[PDB]
Amino acid sequence: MEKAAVNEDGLVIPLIDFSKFLEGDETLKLETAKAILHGFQTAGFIYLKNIPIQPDFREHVFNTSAKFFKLPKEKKLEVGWTTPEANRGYSAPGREKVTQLTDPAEIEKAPDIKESYEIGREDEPGHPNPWPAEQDDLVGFKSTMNNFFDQCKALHIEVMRAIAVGMGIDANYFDSFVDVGDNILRLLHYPAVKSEVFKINPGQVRAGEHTDYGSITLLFQDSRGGLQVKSPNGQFIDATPIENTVVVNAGDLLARWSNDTIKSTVHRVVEPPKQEDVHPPRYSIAYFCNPNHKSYIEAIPGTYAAESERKYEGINSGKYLVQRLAATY
Ligand SMILES: O=C(O)CCC(=O)C(=O)O
Ligand code: NI
């Protein structure tokens, strides 16, 4: 095993070689799957290295993302969300506008310093992706992003197999729960920002603390830093960027699905841990994996020894997620 990616305040996030799961004999594969699962059961986060997604293609996806966010605001808004529940296209958090009708109670006004672009699967009636015009630097944007979507789709399936192998159940247990690919590819851009912004403003952050809603999130980050994970002792710990890794974390739905054997951990993005006048732009890409909308989510076999140990009632996956997202708007 590699040295842990993070080891502080009781938070241990392992660094795991995923090729040893995909290519190993039964025994090396099992060992790797146990390490993966152990990570999810303790930190709720792992780093994976040597995944089947190529570094040059990943670099290209990041360059493609930055070309999109370099578009004028008015062009990015052209691919904004078509409705509030679309969950597809361009978004930027906005603070409420003060007007002569804003009363003293409403004056408690900071939003995430970020913008995003969300892409779902291309074969979903009622939920098409709003693609930008393929011209100048955005030629190939669609094929690049759809490609990356499908590679992340495959990686999700394989992470779930590692979880199944680690649990000692059928390797393919999750396949029929996730095969629709009801996943969201989220491109993120955190603009350049003066460090003084954070000196003046108290709890200004790049992304507010939260847990993810779904099963698994695959997080690709650049070298800027700023991602933090809450330790079991209540303190935020830097998830330092490691070249050519993917950070993988469990979401609330998997915590539940696992009967709380797996952790969904609070995390956030703050100022990078680098002292500088101006913090340059930070790019990341989160691929939110979910069970099929129609899936009924109840305790995974092996996560409870008896009926009484089942902590949660069953729920429909689609329903749960729209509930969590409706509240977000
Ligand atoms: O940008 C990051 O590193 C984390 C983003 C994140 O946690 C999210 O969008 O859910
Ligand atoms: Ni998150």
Author numbering: 1 to 109, 114 to 333
Quote the study on this structure.
Like the TET proteins, T7H is also a Fe2+ and α-KG dependent dioxygenase. Here we report the crystal structures of N. crassa T7H (NcT7H) in apo form, in α-KG-bound form and in complexes with α-KG and T, 5hmU or 5fU. Similar to other α-KG dependent dioxygenases, NcT7H adopts a variation of double-stranded β-helix (DSBH) fold as the core. The active site of NcT7H is located at the front end (opposite to the back end) of the DSBH core and partially covered by the α10 helix at the C-terminus.
In addition, similar to the apo NcT7HΔC structure, a metal ion is bound at the active site, which is assigned as Ni2+ owing to the presence of NiCl2 in the crystallization solution and the verification of the ICP-AES analysis. Structural comparison shows that the α-KG binding does not cause significant conformational changes in the overall structure (RMSD of <1.0 Å for all Cα atoms) but induces small conformational changes at the active site. In the ligand-bound NcT7H structures, the Ni2+ retains the coordinations with the three residues and one water molecule (Wat1), but the other two water molecules are replaced by the C1-carboxylate and C2-oxo groups of α-KG. In the ligand-bound NcT7H structures, α-KG binds to a positively charged pocket with the C5-carboxylate embedded in the pocket and the C1-carboxylate oriented towards the substrate. The C5-carboxylate is stabilized by four hydrogen-bonding interactions with the side chains of Tyr194, Arg286 and Ser288. The C1-carboxylate forms a hydrogen bond with the side chain of Arg190. In the α-KG-bound NcT7H structure, the C3 atom of α-KG is about 3.6 Å away from the hydroxyl group of Tyr194.
